[PDB]
């Protein structure tokens, strides 16, 4: 996969992104 | 809780790291097996050639 | 363990993950400060 | 703020890692097929010698 075409991989990356962006926006409050 | 927050973040990253390793390990598993079976064929051929020449000698 | 090429035994892979983590940890300390 | 940019950076890294790994597996597979083909040759001869 050249841009990453694997749905399992992208799912793992998106979840991490989602979880981290939430923790950070819970640390600034 | 800047220290409690950092621990949570790191546990989460530690998860992700083990998870991405499993993902890559499984992605290339068939190549790792191909190498193993063919490397087995080379052993078998090497256990026939070395037996004939020795016998031949 | 059957192969020395395998990702689980690959120090390049570990380096890349370790670096992501190191960066994220440094980055997030900056965002809080 | 967000970490999107870090992850986008990590995705390119992971793609370069995978390509690299594909190469490493490819060469090793070809190297062993060659060293495999040339074993059937020596066997093909040592059998045809005795005919
Ligand atoms: Cl890339
Ligand atoms: Cl890069
Ligand atoms: Na948002
Ligand atoms: Na660690
Ligand atoms: Na990184
Ligand atoms: Na961009």
Coil, helix or strand at residue C33 = coil
Nearest Cβ partner for B23 among A8, A16, A26:
A8
Residue with tokens 């999107």: D4
Map out the domains of chain D as residue ranges: 1-51
- Rounded to an integer, what distance in angstroms lies between the CA atom of residue C10 and that of residue B25? 10
**In chain A, which ranges are continuous DSSP H helix?**
7-24
* Residues of chain C in Cβ contact (below 8 Å) with chain D: 5, 7, 10, 12-13, 16, 20, 23-24, 27-28, 31
The resolution in Å comes to 2.2
User: 3-state class of A3 per DSSP?
Assistant: coil
């Amino acid at each position: 996969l050249s841009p990453i075409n694997d749905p399992l991989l992208m799912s793992i990356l998106n979840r991490l992104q989602f979880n981290l962006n939430n923790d950070i926006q819970l640390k600034t409050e």
